[model samples]
Structure formats: structure tokens, C-alpha cells
Target chain A: KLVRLPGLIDVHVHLREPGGTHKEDFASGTAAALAGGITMVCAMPNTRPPIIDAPALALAQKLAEAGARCDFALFLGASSENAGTLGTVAGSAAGLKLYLNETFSELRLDSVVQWMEHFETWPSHLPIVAHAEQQTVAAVLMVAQLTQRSVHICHVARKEEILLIKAAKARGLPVTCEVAPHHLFLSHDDLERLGPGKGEVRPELGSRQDVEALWENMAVIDCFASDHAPHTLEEKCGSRPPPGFPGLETMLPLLLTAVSEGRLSLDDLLQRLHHNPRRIFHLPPQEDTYVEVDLEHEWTIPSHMPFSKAHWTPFEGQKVKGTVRRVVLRGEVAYIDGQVLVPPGYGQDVRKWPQGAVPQLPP
Target chain B: KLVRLPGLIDVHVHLREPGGTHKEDFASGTAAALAGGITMVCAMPNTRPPIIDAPALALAQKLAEAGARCDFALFLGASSENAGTLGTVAGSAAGLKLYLNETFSELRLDSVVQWMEHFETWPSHLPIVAHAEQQTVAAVLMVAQLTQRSVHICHVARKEEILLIKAAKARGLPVTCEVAPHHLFLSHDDLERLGPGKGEVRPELGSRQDVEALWENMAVIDCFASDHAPHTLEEKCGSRPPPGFPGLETMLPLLLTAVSEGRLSLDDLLQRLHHNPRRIFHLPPQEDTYVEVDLEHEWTIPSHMPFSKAHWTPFEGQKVKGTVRRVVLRGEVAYIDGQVLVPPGYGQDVRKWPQGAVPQLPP
Candidate 1:
């Protein structure tokens, strides 16, 4: 009933820091990552003031480098005016995060020209991670087609979006996409059950058909992201609860449960959670990083997660088939038995790793 | 520049009566139909009490027979208990309306068994009109496959739903579907511009890419319906505003604008607006009924309309490329220069047309 695998990598997580620390911060957010068996997290850029400038990027790096328990990389948020200055900060970030869709963050790209500007400015070797919805998915892909640049679409939850990405991939568009666990598990029905504040999320919970479609075409999906936007229960339950959910801790167990149900194979999970993420984001290896899971374990997700400051989960009370018993990052016991042992500043920026510091991964 | 079309058919419209008539009623709704150049309209069954049983069906029939100004047909709304009684009233209605997706209606079918009961109880020859969204769409289609019955999906606004319907049609699943003019025209961005109250609608607006996909796959689309569920400005801008719009008056000009823009051809418009609606809904002919349109006339969609109770429009201020010059029903000038000449009782239920009562339409 016990199985060991490579540590999971969540390439899309919102580690709220510098601002909205009450909801989530670098220290607690990475602790949550370790508890969830994630050895590395690629942080999104839509924070307070946003990570669009060099100073903002440095602030995120300074916070994560000093407080994170896991390995990490920060994303450079794209805005209308930041295109020209992106290459200077590209060395320290994960990838350029272009928000083509609406969110609580003010990182939206309205005109196609703005998308073009960012696409043209970013380094060609790295991909642009986009927060795009359905048609925006199409528009972004078309830009990918025209510019002949690699683009990764984030949180693809609709049947139309995934299928469109599928067609692009078939035609060799160099386009990749991600799907959130909530979109795979919850739907519009759950929205009604969770109430408006709890149900509120960018791109929204899709129809059951959308969920099924994502499951049916998992091959089209390249990465499994939590979109780990952590908001406090007060903010979530408030009259104007901003969109997104605390998903960093819930993604693995849900995917593991899918594996238990034979909905997907172990290799499929590995490809989405580990192999694809590292390969797509160009992340360096975390030597000896691995996770030990009780595959036979059955338990409900708690309403309050201790490691994460945001003390709620949309998947609360839902039974999961697996649980992470231990996680080791770089030969250190990072998490064991519902506790994170690694101290603050234990995590290093993967982008800034010394040349030949980590073992080479197969392309 | 003037052209005449065979009285256009709109197989989806809601004439609120014995219910929320303050928003719209049979008389005003049909008069709006005449203004839009629609000669025949199929009324949906989601209402105050809903048209599920014989008495309910009779009330709708009597109401339309007395108050409607254009040819009409009543749909028998499906509920958990009405499967046994649907066959009895099949002769008097258009077809069964299944609310597999959520909205203001209480006719939701939660389980697969509920869908099966309604699918099995309804006559095989007649098609079932479903208000099912994306995945519910797949469920309903699979039910249609199991029962070997005909089903027409209503207001297909998403790419996934339309493409799925396309795939079903390709495989010969005896499936057909309609796209609302609003879905074809409006998108999620419009929702923000229109605000919640004015932007409100069921199967809510899709992404811009979704709109493009719908247009790209018009071959899979069978009919063009307004889904003309009118709601007043007061009701719309209220705290608990209902989902729907007054589309009966806007459907024609919008389609004409698409025609002028060369997005669709004259034949394409007629097939979806006339031939296909009559074929799919099993509707009868309207002799000597035709609409004269000034194809080159351009005008702004009005905010306040004389014929409809819902005096506001999402398309308000949108410039249209064509206008309805006149509408004649059975040799009578029912609508000319924005005036409705005929009385309320002018319209008759096409489903109840007597044997040899009209000329046979070319199949």
C-alpha cells in the first residue's frame, strides 16, 4: 500500500507575500507545499503591486529565499509597460506570466497588441505562461502560431479550451496547457453547494461536461497546476470574495485518488505532476527529492490546513485515496507525519542554481 | 435593395403568461416577433407554474390561441413526474422541453434516471428540446443514443457543446441543435459591459473564441432561435434579477447584420431561420406569409421598443446593417413600417393545423 515517487512540482501556485500575508505568505505557503509532497513551486506574479518590475521580482525572491521550505522559482508578471524590461529579470524568474483573462489581480492584457508586445519581448528559449480562458485560449494560441513561440495556457477547464489546445498541439503549434484539480473534481453544481463566495473563482467552476472533457483528453493537458491562490475564509465568505482557491495542498491527493479509481495510470500522474512540469518550465532537478505516499489511505481533507495560512479547502470533507507520509527535498527530510521539518530559507531559487549544480534530466 | 424572405421561423421564445407577464406576454412577444420578421415562434415551457401537465398545457394553448399575433407552438415542459402523461398531450405541443441545465425554471432533472424517464416516455418521432449545458449536453445526447430518440439541444453557446453535437451528427446519432442569436453575437466581455442585470442570461455568455467556434461550425448548427425570454428593465436591474433577455425583436436585425458582414450567406440564414427550424420541430407551413426587408438599411438597435414590455436591450446602440421593412401573414400586412396591423388572435398554433390546412413544404 506504500509507494515512493519523485517529488511533485506545482508550476502554478500563488504564494501571497509582501501583501495579503494574513491570507498566505512565503513561510506558510511553502510549508503547505512540503506537506502536500511538493518539492518545488513556481510562484505566480499577480500579488500586491504585482511582480512586474525588478524590485518587485527581487522582493518575491528575497522573501522566498529566506522563508520557503521548498525549492522555488518566481514568475515575472507581464503588464503593458513591462515588455521592454522583462529580459533583464528573466534570469531570476520561472517564466513570463501573461494574464489574458480577468482575475482579482490587475494583471490583465486587453488588446492582442499587448500579447504581441510581451511575446516579442520575452526570451525565445523560455515559454510564456498565460492565464487565458476559452476564446482567449484560441487567441493566445493563434499568437503562438503567428509568432512561432512556445506558450503555455494555464487553468484550462472547459471542453472547448482543451480541445482547441489539442488541435493546436496536433498541428505542431508548440503550445502547451495546464488544468487545475478543482476543474477536474468540482463543477457548477459544487458552486451552488459551496455558495457564491466559496464558489467564486476566476474562469469559474465549469459545467460537469467541462470536467469530463478535461478527463477525456488528459493527453492534451501538459501540466497539473493547483493555481494555489490562497484567500482567507473571511475574504472568501465576504460579500466581495475575490476569485481563486487554496489548492496547493489538495491537488496531489485528488490526483492520487484518480489513480486509485483507475481513472489514470501512475505514469500519467508522474508525467503531469513531475516530468511535464520540470521539462516545460525548464526547472533544475532537486537531487534525491521524493515523496512517500500511503496509496491505501482513505481520509477526509480537513477544513483547516495547519501549514497553509488560508485555512480552508474546496475539497474539504471529500475522501481521498492516498496521503503523503513523507517528502525529502535534496536528501533532507522536508516533511513527515503531518509536519514540515525543513526550516525557513531551506529552499533555493532553481533558476539561479549554479551551472552543473544539479543532475541533468532527460529531455 | 429590398428582398423578401419566407416568414422566418424562431423555434425558441418565451411568452410569459399565467406567470411573469410584466416582463413579457404572448401578445407583446408575438408582436415583437412580427417586428423582427419572424412569422412562426416555438414557445419554451419554463414559466410561473411551468407547462408540465394537461391543464398547464391547455392554459398555454388557450393563451397563445387568443393572444399571439404570429404562428406559434407550445412546448410541454418536462418534470420528474410527467413522463407518463407526455404522450397524451404530444399532439398539442411542439415537443418536450428538458431543463437539464439550471436557470429560473424548477424543471431540473438531477439524475440520469430522470432523463431516461422523460426520454423514454416522450414519443420517438418527436424531438426533445433540452436546456442542457456542456457536460449535461453529453449526458442528454448519450440518453438520446440509448433510447434511439431524436433530441434538439437548445442555446448551444460553447465550442465544446457545438463540436460535440457536430461529432454526434457525423456519427448519425439522430441529434440536432440550435444556437441562440445572442450566443452567436454576445460574449463574456459583453457581460461586463452590459452589467449583471442587463448581461444576465442562461447558459451565460461564452468566450470570444467560443463565439468564433460557433460561427466556424455553423454547418453543425440546425436552427437560429432568439430564446426571446423577455425581462423588464425593473426586473433586470433588481437585486434578484432573473436570467434572460428580450431577444425576439433583436434576432432578425442581428442575423441580417451577420449576413451583411458576409459571415453567413442568404441561403445559410434561410436554412437555419426557416427550413431547418420547420424540419427539426415538425412545424407546419404559413401560406402567403413573407417578410420584406431593406437589406441595405442600417440602423441602431433601440433601447426602448414599442412592441415589447422589456424595453431595454444588450444590443442597444449597436448599429445593424439591415432592417425589417414589412411582415405579411396570410395576405395581411401584420407588420409594416414598425406598426402591427393585425389583432392578437391572428396567430395560430402550427402543431394543431388541420389536415390539408396548408401547402406541403419541400423536405
Candidate 2:
């Protein structure tokens, strides 16, 4: 059936299993994906002890294969502590994660160069997802010159860096990027007024110009992901809470309202949300139209009962004039109208790398 | 009868009555205030057609008196179209509100000087409350210069401004400020991840420097007030949702955590929460140490049974380390152990100025 043209795929999400079930396990997250009309999702490696090494990645794949309930892939986290794990990652990683900040110290760029040299030389045809917020823009620009892969920028939130992405795109760099719902709608002014959870971030709220610039990038940005990190309202509103919101369920509504309001486009929406991640990650379609969404339907979002473990969504109780009616995953319907159609399944076991690949040092 | 020392008073809050009862009204808001241990509350005049005049202020006060469950006062809005109303407001207003940006455009230094001159010559006593941030710094200077009565600085989240206010106090400025809970913990960096509501304003959240500065200022700063503006989630998280949060309930618990953590003192806490607004707004006290709080007691905030007509609060499901155990008003048991004791009563009438009493102008 013709679902919406180029229907949705999410190659980035957190299916907290094998470690954390208190937040979201594979079943709960996939159920939420079904509600948002998302088809394929990629899980990040920052779960229990970062997802590194061949054995662990394979185990993750096995877990998804056993019961993921939707199409999904696993990412390999690049840590200085796990120097050799990148090599194992070359054959099965959806992408590599370069964590730049230490909860106590900073992630050195020289260390990132170690992994980049390996990936650049390797014939694995793998894309590297740079946690682009490497040392606040000044530091990012200094090292950005060394990157040349299909670099998928994670969360282009602030204005100056977003402008950098535009400059890189204008230069025709084979770069793909993602922005969270928070980036397009929030500015420093909001940060000033709301204080911590609202404006409190690792990389703070961008300036007014940064917000305007982000809005400009939203028109042409590559992919849109919720980064759907969950935290209790206690954690979010607490004195020293980590920054981020559980945004998946509200991502579609928030974005749909933006599209409905002409801040973005259906094509732009499809490209970032449904199309780009698939192409960049080289993820094959689980179904021609994996997740089903009626682009023309309008519905009010009910406030309570979100799939995320965190109950306080920054987007809660909002009536976004658009709704996700149903999501189809691998020919089986998953959710329809606030109801789930299919029980959990051994979700699609995603391959990190395409068929045959070899690793080598860059010339 | 023994009256509370630094008794409960809310300077900035919305009753939402006269319209939009489906959201909130005077009856519900005042009932909530009494329930939450607030003795007197000055309602913001942003109702239908906006409360821009003395007669309108009187009507709002009348409604709060007849229908309210607690004592109430009204703020008269200063608009370009109603600068003439300033003279009359001096008779009945707890304070005057100036929004230099949109609705009350251009009530800056010159117009403020004129209003100060009018108050100096007029036959009444009243203080001036500048929105403190149509550009926060200038508002501080203007209010300090215009009235000898304390200047209620709203939503102070910026660390620099906190220090600035401290320095201003060192210079003997009679500035009283309120920091909404949202700005206390959240930051601009948070806006990048959580997006819009994350960075919204009761007053804007400042940088860590700003927040830390606010912490430092807490020693000398006056009070706490939830600029509890409630917008429907449709209006908040939607395409053009206006910026603000419902903070009345969250403000105390979040700050209590701050106290529990050694960030502030109970003395500073009581000063900000009870002492400051009470003295400035002329709300009668009930007894010395009237509100009894069990500092060691722990309570998790129950969701959405707040005193406001607004159905939401940023502080849903939060666990607070401290809670108000009992609150007495005018020598009578008013609120106790998570419940209110008194039935509704007419709020205290707006105090009339002594004949020929002129509001003193500052520098």
C-alpha cells in the first residue's frame, strides 16, 4: 500500500535494554516508535558501559533479533578507553559516536583523529556520526577541516554551528545532519526565563541570531531525531539535572505543526525524518513505506501516557494540529489511533556495515 | 491576635478570572493560594482588555474580596494608552506594571520619570514594579530611581544581574527580587536539548555564572514568587505558543531542595518567600513564624491539583525534600499537612493612602 511517499525511518534512538530497563526497554521504545509512525530505528551505544567491540555489538544485534518489535540498528561508541573497538565497529556499526565531553573531563580531538584515520582509510563504507558539539564552535571549526566521510552531524542546535553546517553544505561536503525539536523552537531568551531544564544544556541555548540561523537550517537540514533521552521530572527539574527531554512521541506533533505552519515542508520533513537517515546510514527499507502517517490528518495529542519512562515531556499537553494515525513495520501494523495493532516481535536485526568491507589506515 | 512574621504573600500570579474559567478564575486562584499557604496575592492585570486602569483594578480587587478564599491585591498595568491612569492607580494599586516591549510600549526612562513625578505629587502611596527585563538591567535602575518602596525584580536567573543587584544593594538601592524556580535550575544549554519550554521564562534562566550569581544574591535578595503564567500546552509547545510556565507549586519545592542542598539558608528562604512581598505590598501578617515547614520531611508533589485554574505546572511528579506542614493566617489554622483548613473569605480591601501622603521618589 502507498503509505506516505518516502515514509519514515529513524536510525537513531535509545532502546535501553541489556542494561537500563527503568527508562525504556526495547519493547517500550519500539511501541512509542509505532505510535509516532516511525519504521526503522538505530540504537545508540551510550547505554550501560558504551556499546563497543564486536562481541557486544553482535550481542546487541542478537537482542534486537530476539525481540525488538520494529526495524532497528546498533551504533558503536568511540571511546579513548576503547581504542581498538573502532576496528571491530567498521564491519557492523550503523555509525561511530565520538563523545567529546567527559562528565568530569573533556574528550580530546586528537583521540578522535585516531578513529577518524582508521575509518577514513578503511574500505568499510561506514558513516561516522560526529557528536558535532566538540568544544563549543571555536574548537569544532579548528578540527572540522580533517573530517571527509559522510559525516552525519548530531544535533545542530545553536546558530553559529548551524551556520557552519550551511557553509559546509554550500561547499558540497557529503555531510548529513540532525536537529532535535528543541533547536528549532527555543532560543536564549527562553533559557534566560525558564532557567535550567528549559535553557540548561551542555551546549547552552544559542543566541537570537543562532536561533534564526537554526530556523534557516531547518529548511535544508538533513534528518530530524528526538534524541529521545528520558529523565524523570525530578531529574529534569532538579538542581543539577542533565540536559535533554524525552521527545519521540511529541516529535511528530511538534514537527508537523511546524510543517503545517510553513516553518518547514512535507518534502523537507520527509527528507530529514524519513529519507536522509536511510541514505546516509545505508539502511535498507524494512518496507517501502515502513511507518505509516496520514500527512493530511489532524488530531489533538492526549497529554498523559507517553511511551518514554520520563513523564515530563517539554511538549506535553500540546495540541499539535497533526497526528500519526498508524505505523506499519515490516508489513505488520504496529499502532493505530492510540492503540497498538501488533504485539512485540523479534525486530529486524540490522547489519551495521554493508556486506564485504576491509579496514586500512588512511593514505 | 498574633499575625505571621514575614507572612505569606504572592506578588506576581494570575487568577485568570473575569474570563477563561475553564482555565482559572479568582475563586479557584485564591482558594489555591490559601491552600498553598499564601495569605495575600496581587493579581496581574493581563485579563481581557487587560487591567490598565484603577477602576479595572478595583473591580478585580472586588471580585477577589467577594469570591476569593484568601486576601488579594491588584496590579495596575502601565500602557502608553493609559499613562493617565497611573495617577488613579496610586490610590488602589499594590504596584504599577510596566512592560516596555509590546503591550505597554515605550514606558522607559522618560515616561518612567513622568510616572515617578506624578507619584511624587499625587495624594497616594504606591511602588513601581518594572517588568525588570524588557532588558533586565535598565528596568532595575528605573524602578530603583522611581520609588523608595522596594522594587520587585521578577524572574532573576542571570548570575551577573544577581551580582549587579547585590552591588546595587551595596549602593543602598531598595530593590527586591523574585527568582522563579524554572530559572533557578535550568540553563540556556538546556534549551538546545529540551527546546522551547525548557528555555521559557517566568524570567529567563541565565548562564551558570548567572545562576551562581543568583545563588550569591540569595543572601541579600528579597523573595520568591511564581510569575505563574499559564498557557495551554497548545499555546506553549505549539507552533506559536507564548513563553511562560505555571510555577506557583513548583517554586517552593524546587527552592526547598536548594535549601536542603546548602545552596541557600532557611532565613534567606523565608525572607524571599514571605517577608519581602508582604512588607512591600502591605499584606497583613497572621503570626510570627506562622507557616510551619518540616524541613526534614519529604514529599513527592502530587500531579495537577494546583490552586491555579491552569491545569499544568512545570513541576509535575517532582519529589521535594521539604514541605509546608502547617500554615496559620490571622491567628487561625489556615492550612495543614497537605490540606487547607479555612473556608473562603473576602480578601483585605485595598488600603487607602492617608490624605496628602505622597509616594516618595527615589534617585
DockQ of 2: 0.01
User: Per-residue lDDT for B267 in model 1?
Assistant: 98
After superposing candidate 2 on the true structure, give the runs of residues whose Cα lies further than 4 Å from its correct spot: A1-5, A102-124, A134-150, A189-195, A198-203, A294-305, A352-363, B1-363
lDDT of 2: 0.62
RMSD to truth, every model: 9.8, 19.6
Candidate 2 lDDT tens digits, B78-135? 6555655467456566667755333323233223334344334433346666565422
Residue A200 displacement (Å), model 2: 4.1
Query: What are the TM-scores, per candidate, against the unseen true structure?
Result: 0.55, 0.46
Q: Write the per-residue lDDT of candidate 1 for residues B119-230, one digit (tens) a residue.
A: 7777766668888776566656655654657888899989877876776666667878889988998999887679988888898998999999999999999888988878
Please write out the lDDT profile of model 1 over residues A1-363, one tens digit for every residue: 569999899999999887878988889999999888899999988888699999999888999899888999998988877887877678667888988767544676545656766777787777688887755665565455445578898999898777767756665668888899999999998976688998889879999898999999989988899999899889999988989889888888999999999999999999999999988887777898899998898988889777788898888878998888999999999999788899999998888887312233445
By lDDT, the best candidate is: 1
Global lDDT scores for all candidate models: 0.83, 0.62
Overall local distance difference test of candidate 1: 0.83
Clashing pairs in 1: A135-B209, A209-B135
